[PDB]
Design a protein around this ligand. Structure first.
Ligand SMILES: O=c1ccn([C@@H]2O[C@H](COP(=O)(O)OP(=O)(O)O)[C@@H](O)[C@H]2O)c(=O)[nH]1
Ligand SMILES: [Mg+2]
Length: 451
């Protein structure tokens, strides 16, 4: 069956970095017979920045599709996306299979360069193709290049299996190769690779009989497999893909970062988010890590806003950044204190002998960042992204200009989560295990165990 003439990229969370956009643009330009599509999630995205991004992509002739609008976001995927710190690797691993089932075509990571265009028609014997090449290595297994015909059954089976793998993530034991991988690569990377990544894929392909007994995790031996599953039906290096030695991959999902706007949400909003996520865990597995949710919820970074002028309503204990009326004018940063007083954050004009404190000053670094904005009246999505990032993490030496970020402790939050969950009679009855290391809550987990 013919591979549908679509090239699919995924970027969820904040806005796709410039480097990645350049890569996508190159793929689009070099493969004009294919529709190039960037997939996003509008539900967690920063709305203003995403709007700018979409308009930009339209101007470059790149289609943007939303995972929710197209119906490719399973509940399990929504579940990871709505976490306060999503594993975007897991999300992307799951989404690519659902997109391919729905539309067919070619999934690519945006950290692979195009060294040759695809054939105008690709005909796949089993409606499904993998690359023997990944991250500059030949005769390997990876999941960053996947081709199929719309509605392919292998792709559909993989999508179902990865959903089950993900749902079972908190029962995942670091054994076999993963015991080692935990030690070498760390817990986050090991678990990702095993649950949704090339580890998951390896085991699923073996179960399906697509890889035979001669194939091993770290020695796939494509030359001993059915090469009709491979692009161009061969283990030979494909012409299409290139990476330089000094950047074989981006590992962009590895940092654990809060999703957009967490720091600006109300406690009650965040709490209810956690409650719904826990409810899903309980319904699907009967098991939830209470500490995961509590340890996320306790984090309060700086609240912030970028506006044209004093917002119709001020947020107490936050930063408010005001753009100039003209492209030449200076920005104004305010610390909005707990009583909603605008405290202007300013710096003296310095020259002559350089003070080593001032070069290392958070506020001067911030000021420098603002000065490099091309058009203060019309900042780009990436500019807004960088300024927001700076504001979230800004820690002035002046206590008068420092956000207080007064917030509940993890244990108190966990107690509240426990009460709300266990007060639901249906949920209570569905709990089989609860992971907690909170001293006040271990007892309550024992109490329910008796019941
Ligand atoms: O903030 C992020 C980081 C990563 N990703 C997704 O994660 C995929 C894999 O990232 P990367 O290629 O950097 O990982 P690596 O190939 O090094 O494992 C990307 O293509 C995106 O779909 C995402 O959506 N948002
Ligand atoms: Mg990659």
């Amino acid at each position: 069956a013919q591979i549908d003439k679509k090239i699919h990229f995924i970027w969820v969370g904040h806005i796709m970095p410039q480097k990645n956009i350049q890569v996508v643009s190159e793929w689009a330009e070099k493969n004009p017979g294919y529709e190039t599509i960037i997939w996003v999630d509008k539900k967690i995205a920063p709305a203003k920045e995403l709007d700018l991004f979409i308009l930009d992509m339209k101007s470059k002739g790149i289609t943007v599709k939303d995972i929710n609008e197209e119906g490719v976001c399973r509940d399990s995927i929504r579940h990871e996306l709505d976490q306060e710190s999503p594993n975007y690797g897991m999300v992307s691993d799951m989404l690519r299979l659902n997109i391919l089932a729905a539309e067919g075509g070619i999934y690519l990571d945006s950290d692979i360069l195009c060294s040759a265009p695809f054939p105008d028609e690709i005909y796949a014997p089993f409606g499904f193709l993998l690359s023997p090449w990944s991250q500059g290595a030949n005769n390997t297994l990876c999941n960053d290049i996947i081709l199929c015909s719309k509605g392919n059954q292998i792709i559909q089976q993989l999508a179902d299996a990865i959903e089950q793998s993900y749902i079972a993530r908190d029962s995942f034991e670091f054994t076999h190769e993963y015991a080692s991988m935990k030690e070498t690569k760390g817990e986050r990377i090991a678990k990702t690779l095993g649950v949704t990544g090339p580890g998951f894929l390896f085991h699923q392909l073996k179960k399906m009989g697509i890889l035979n007994d001669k194939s091993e995790m770290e020695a796939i031996h494509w030359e001993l497999q059915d090469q009709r599953y491979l692009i161009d039906g061969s283990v030979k290096e494909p012409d299409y893909f290139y990476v330089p030695q000094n950047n074989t991959n981006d590992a962009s999902w590895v940092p654990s970062i809060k999703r957009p706007g967490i720091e600006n949400m109300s406690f009650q909003e965040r709490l209810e988010n956690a409650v719904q996520l826990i409810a899903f865990d309980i319904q699907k597995t009967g098991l939830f890590n209470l500490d995961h949710y509590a340890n996320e919820l306790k984090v309060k970074q700086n609240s912030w806003c970028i506006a044209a002028e004093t917002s119709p309503e001020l947020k107490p204990d936050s930063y408010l950044l005001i753009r100039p009326r003209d492209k030449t004018g200076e920005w104004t940063l305010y610390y909005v204190d707990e009583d909603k007083k605008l405290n202007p954050v300013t710096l003296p004009v310095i020259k002559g002998a350089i003070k080593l404190s001032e070069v290392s000053d958070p506020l001067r670094k911030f000021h420098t960042l603002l000065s490099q904005v091309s058009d203060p009246v019309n900042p780009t999505a990436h500019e807004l992204k960088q300024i927001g990032r700076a504001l979230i993490e800004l820690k002035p030496r002046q206590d008068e200009w420092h956000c207080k970020n007064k917030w509940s402790g993890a244990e108190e939050i966990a107690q509240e989560l426990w009460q709300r969950i266990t007060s639901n009679e249906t949920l209570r009855a569905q709990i089989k295990q609860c992971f907690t290391q909170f001293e006040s809550l271990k007892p309550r987990v024992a109490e329910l165990g008796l019941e």
